[PDB]
Amino acid sequence: GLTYSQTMELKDSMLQLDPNAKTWIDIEGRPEDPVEIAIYQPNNGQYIHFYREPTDIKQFKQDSKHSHGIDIQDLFSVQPGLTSAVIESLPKNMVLSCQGADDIRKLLDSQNRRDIKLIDVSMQKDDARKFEDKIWDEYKHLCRMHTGIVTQEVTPHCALLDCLMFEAAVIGSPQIPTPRPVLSRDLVFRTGPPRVVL
Ligand SMILES: [Mn+2]
Numbered sequence: 103g104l105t106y107s108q109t110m111e112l113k114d115s116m117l118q119l120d121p122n123a124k125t126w127i128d129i130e131g132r133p134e135d136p137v138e139i140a141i142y143q144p145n146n147g148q149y150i151h152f153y154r155e156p157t158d159i160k161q162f163k164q165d166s167k168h169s170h171g172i173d174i175q176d177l178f179s180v181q182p183g184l185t186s187a188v189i190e191s192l193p194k195n196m197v198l199s200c201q202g203a204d205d206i207r208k209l210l211d212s213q214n215r216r217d218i219k220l221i222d223v224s225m226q227k228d229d230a231r232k233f234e235d236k237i238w239d240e241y242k243h244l245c246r247m248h249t250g251i252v253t254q255e256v257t258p259h260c261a262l263l264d265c266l267m268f269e270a271a272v273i274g275s276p277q278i279p280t281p282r283p284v285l286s287r288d289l290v291f292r293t294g295p296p297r298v299v300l
């Protein structure tokens with residue numbers, strides 16, 4: 103997982119979160135094997151967003167085709183250990199918002215963070231994704247990892263854009279403060295993005 107350097111750097115970045123502010127959390131992949139996690143504070147735009155290689159390639163490929171459309175080959179360049187490091191450093195008794203809490207509860211409990219409380223906004227399925235297209239149009243530049251065609255052909259689920267669109271649904275408008283990542287790209291990825299030489 104992370105080095106001492108990376109652990110110290112991760113911890114400093116996470117202090118940029120406001121412990122009392124509304125915080126969304128969303129994940130892609132099962133809670134025992136997640137591949138994408140986003141923790142997002144709408145009021146100030148800050149978000150923690152990272153990825154993880156799957157242990158179970160069989161289930162991953164199903165999730166790829168029917169949910170997030172992530173290419174497993176893209177995940178080989180993501181930094182391991184972030185999931186446990188981030189969840190360990192979340193503030194004591196922090197309260198997080200989510201759309202469906204069952205999988206998040208298991209993931210947090212698995213990290214011995216039962217102290218973290220979940221507010222399940224429990225939105226109707228389509229009410230929750232009312233602003234999906236407008237969120238994807240404005241903010242899909244923020245995540246490059248959903249490259250496959252997803253079927254159920256629907257828009258793929260991104261943990262980060264899910265958080266953004268759930269917030270837009272609550273407030274009835276795509277008008278949210280500008281999202282801004284707190285993690286350094288060099289902490290999220292262990293090898294830089296390859297550009298096609300043209
Ligand atoms: Mn999602």
Ligand SMILES: [Zn+2]
Nearest residue numbers: 245260261262
């Ligand atoms: Zn994404």
